[PDB]
Amino acid sequence: MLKKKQLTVLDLHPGAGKTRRVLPEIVREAIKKRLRTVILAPTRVVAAEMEEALRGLPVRYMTTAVNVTHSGTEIVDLMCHATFTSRLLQPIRVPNYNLNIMDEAHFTDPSSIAARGYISTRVEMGEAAAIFMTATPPGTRDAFPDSNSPIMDTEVEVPERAWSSGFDWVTDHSGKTVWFVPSVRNGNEIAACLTKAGKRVIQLSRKTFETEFQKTKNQEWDFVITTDISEMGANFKADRVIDSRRCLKPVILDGERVILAGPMPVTHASAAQRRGRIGRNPNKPGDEYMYGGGCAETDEGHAHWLEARMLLDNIYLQDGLIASLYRPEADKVAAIEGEFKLRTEQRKTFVELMKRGDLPVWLAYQVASAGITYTDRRWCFDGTTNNTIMEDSVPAEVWTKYGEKRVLKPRWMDARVCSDHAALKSFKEFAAGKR
Numbered sequence: 101m102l103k104k105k106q107l108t109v110l111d112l113h114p115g116a117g118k119t120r121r122v123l124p125e126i127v128r129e130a131i132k133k134r135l136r137t138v139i140l141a142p143t144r145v146v147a148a149e150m151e152e153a154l155r156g157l158p159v160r161y162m163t164t165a166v167n168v169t170h171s172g173t174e175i176v177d178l179m180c181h182a183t184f185t186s187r188l189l190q191p192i193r194v195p196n197y198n199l200n201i202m203d204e205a206h207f208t209d210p211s212s213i214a215a216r217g218y219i220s221t222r223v224e225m226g227e228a229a230a231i232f233m234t235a236t237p238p239g240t241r242d243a244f245p246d247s248n249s250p251i252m253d254t255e256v257e258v259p260e261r262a263w264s265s266g267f268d269w270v271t272d273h274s275g276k277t278v279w280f281v282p283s284v285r286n287g288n289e290i291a292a293c294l295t296k297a298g299k300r301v302i303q304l305s306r307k308t309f310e311t312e313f314q315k316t317k318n319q320e321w322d323f324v325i326t327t328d329i330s331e332m333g334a335n336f337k338a339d340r341v342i343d344s345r346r347c348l349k350p351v352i353l354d355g356e357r358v359i360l361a362g363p364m365p366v367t368h369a370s371a372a373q374r375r376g377r378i379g380r381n382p383n384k385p386g387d388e389y390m391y392g393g394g395c396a397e398t399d400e401g402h403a404h405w406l407e408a409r410m411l412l413d414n415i416y417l418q419d420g421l422i423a424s425l426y427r428p429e430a431d432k433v434a435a436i437e438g439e440f441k442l443r444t445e446q447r448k449t450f451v452e453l454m455k456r457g458d459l460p461v462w463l464a465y466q467v468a469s470a471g472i473t474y475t476d477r478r479w480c481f482d483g484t485t486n487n488t489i490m491e492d493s494v495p496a497e498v499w500t501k502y503g504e505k506r507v508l509k510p511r512w513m514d515a516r517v518c519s520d521h522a523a524l525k526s527f528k529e530f531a532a533g534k535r
């Protein structure tokens with residue numbers, strides 16, 4: 101496993117103990133061999149759970165999700181997927197880790213795909229070893245993998261709107277349900293319907309995950325309404341998963357705008373991970389998985405793989421060489437390696453628009469490659485009229501940094517900047533020069 105030029109896919113079924121049993125074995129083995137090691141957690145929630153499984157082992161925790169005084173002599177680093185890729189993009193020294201361990205290595209967010217591309221390229225160059233930990237490696241066709249205890253799989257019509265009748269099985273349940281919805285706004289409507297029915301609902305999304313997930317432990321609940329973010333190692337004590345089997349897909353249209361297409365079927369990997377939230381207790385057979393559609397390989401043409409190429413094109417590897425995508429997922433995008441390579445100043449802008457600016461990768465690239473500096477926000481208002489951002493059927497309005505009320509009308513339209521109320525609120529602050 102740990103010998104150089106080796107990439108190992110640890111593809112044990114969900115709940116088989118890859119994180120709490122195998123990972124500590126690997127780490128103390130790497131420490132014994134004096135292997136400089138990075139451990140990549142998908143979320144800060146998983147990072148904290150890793151500290152529990154690795155407590156007592158000398159691990160440097162490069163995340164504020166853990167309150168640990170470090171000795172400085174640790175050769176094992178732990179950080180989130182996004183942090184790894186961020187540090188590669190920034191002008192700071194990143195060690196050339198001899199061992200690279202990515203947990204929940206199926207994560208399809210751009211910074212996770214890029215991290216796999218960079219790591220797998222170093223392995224292919226014979227410079228490092230890597231272990232990708234996931235029950236669902238890229239290209240999985242099995243949406244019903246093995247589990248610790250038998251699961252009741254039922255294909256059933258699943259609501260995606262509020263309902264008044266026809267779905268008694270949803271509310272008649274007396275256990276705890278994790279419900280995968282295609283979007284935040286879709287989850288809002290389902291959540292309000294359940295709450296009106298007397299249910300206690302917790303809602304999880306990417307922006308609220310590292311805070312709202314604590315509620316699943318601190319208070320009692322009946323339903324968790326979650327987007328696909330809970331595919332990344334989120335553990336619940338539930339006995340039922342309701343799966344719409346649907347997701348949104350960011351799609352670049354004509355190379356000039358990003359739309360959120362769908363909802364449309366999830367991949368087999370996503371369906372397996374959603375189902376894999378339950379059936380994890382061998383002493384509690386008969387957890388239920390209700391799914392409301394089929395699977396399809398909807399990661400092809402998905403904007404995240406193009407955005408991953410935008411990131412990797414701007415990460416130094418060796419002279420002019422450029423890291424390739426991890427080969428099992430390299431065909432999901434039609435992109436020329438290097439075509440998004442920016443020069444020094446435009447690359448700095450690109451990085452700042454993604455970090456401080458909190459813009460989607462694709463949008464950050466359009467602005468940076470147009471030669472616009474980070475604080476120049478005139479592009480948020482000089483787009484075409486079809487690019488007018490709407491909220492509550494009225495055009496969105498902000499006060500510009502000059503003190504002028506203007507309609508939000510970005511030169512490049514990325515639907516992710518206004519996918520829900522919170523997203524648009526953040527983009528309005530950006531357009532106003534507030535960060």
Ligand SMILES: Cc1noc(NC(=O)CC2CCCC2)n1
Pocket residue numbers: 182183185186189209210211212454455459460461
């Ligand atoms: C999903 C999604 N939304 O935005 C992003 N941005 C990035 O992954 C860029 C990386 C990560 C941190 C800074 C550099 N991914």
